[PDB]
């Protein structure tokens, strides 16, 4: 990829380093916060100390009329709750009004990601990606987004999102671009004291990446063996999740009654949360919460991986129960129950966790229930029993809605968890 900068967490020295081979120095401010689950994820808040400065290896400093180059990174931007029309920088490689930079903005309910080039005569070119907050379920709001920006000095700058080309702008009218010796990762000019971003995997490439390269990069950095929650973070054990069923996003999961004679079902309406002319979204913190419990994961840590065997705890009136069924019950759709954990006995309760990767909304999960001999009982979804859509496990080779997302409470979403 002609990679000339690759910011990566290194376990041995417990530190962010440049692993490109060029050994650019990475200085971290005391205001930077790290995810304890994934040390590549760093949080930059609106504080002077919340910054990362890269001192570029002399050989990778950009000063050229013709050198093609690209950059990639992942970013997670909290919902905007207030207007600003206050464009603020987040990644800066500028000196004397020339170079490149990434900035963010929020206007007319659109969150914007902005790429700017500026030549040594002060002339600017920009390419923008934007997405609306006026939408029931967003692939983008407060979710990890993969950004790739490529620059061909003889033609266009292009912005790719999650491996897909979104926008292009001609940049052939720019002359010499003399960028900074340093790259500054920092909220610069942001007037909201409480704004922040999450970022990871920042890369620079000494070429214009092509379509295939970018899709491969996206796929390789997706960590596709690990399940994701709604926000795109690693799915985890022992963490309460609200459940989104993608079949009918306007409904939510509820428990009619606990016990092996009870059932769960699809209840509506989910409803919406609104701040007029700022956002209008489906309410996410609705319905029964699931907690994923370790059973047979080979691993030590709390991350849920493809084909992990787990138990699912179901929270009802602030008490935990176990998702289970008697597969011997009549019919191909096995109605699921929330049963008292000490009393689950010989009921089927082992769930195989699966990723679902297609070209629709990201971070989809499936759950395949098995009996205690490993035999498939079926994927967890719904079946219409006259008037009621009940939660069931059903073998597809023997009913609907077996695609799920797990939603934990997150400060960037802004529904109150009170």
Numbering used by the authors: 863 to 1260, 1269 to 1288
Sentences from the paper on this structure:
BoNTs specifically target neuromuscular junctions (NMJ), where the toxins are internalized into neuronal cells, cleave the soluble N-ethylmaleimide sensitive factor attachment protein receptors (SNAREs) complex, inhibit the release of neurotransmitter acetylcholine, and eventually paralyze the affected muscles. Structurally, BoNT consists of an N-terminal light chain (LC, ~50 kDa) that is a metalloprotease and a C-terminal heavy chain (HC, ~100 kDa). The latter could be further divided into two domains: the N-terminal portion (~50 kDa) is the translocation domain (HN) required for the LC to be released into the cytosol; the C-terminal part (HC) is the receptor-binding domain responsible for the highly specific binding and endocytosis of BoNT into motoneurons. Amino acid (AA) sequence alignments based on genome sequences of strain IBCA10-7060 showed that the HC of this toxin is most similar to that of BoNT/A1 (~84% identity), while its LC and HN share ~81% and ~64% identity to that of BoNT/F5, respectively.
We then determined the crystal structure of HCHA at 1.8 Å resolution. After large-scale crystallization screens, HCHA was successfully crystallized at 1 mg/mL, an unusually low protein concentration for protein crystallization in general. Dramatically different solubility in solution was observed between HCHA and HCA1, which was largely caused by variation of a single residue (HCA1-R1156 and HCHA-M1148). In BoNT/A8, this loop is longer than that in other subtypes because of a unique arginine insertion that makes BoNT/A8 the longest BoNT/A subtype. The third notable difference is that a 3/10-helix (residues S955-S957) linking β8 and β9 in HCA1 is unstructured in HCHA due to the deletion of two residues in this region. In HCHA this loop (residues E1218-K1226) swings ~45 degrees towards the center of the HCC subdomain compared to that of HCA1. This is likely caused by residue HCHA-R1224 (equivalent to HCA1-T1232), which forms multiple hydrogen bonds with residues R1005 and W1006. The alignment also suggests that a surface-exposed loop in the GBS neighborhood on BoNT/HA (residues I1263-A1266) is highly similar to BoNT/A8 (residues V1272-A1275), but differs from BoNT/A1 (residues I1271-S1274) (blue arrows). This region of HCHA is likely flexible because the electron densities from residues R1261-R1268 were missing in our structure. For example, an arginine on HCA1 (R1156) that contributes a crucial cation-π interaction with SV2C-F563 is replaced by a methionine (M1148) on HCHA. Furthermore, while HCA1-R1294 forms three hydrogen bonds with C520, T521, and D539 of SV2C through its long, well-extended side-chain, these hydrogen bondings are likely missing on HCHA because HCA1-R1294 is replaced by a serine (HCHA-S1286).
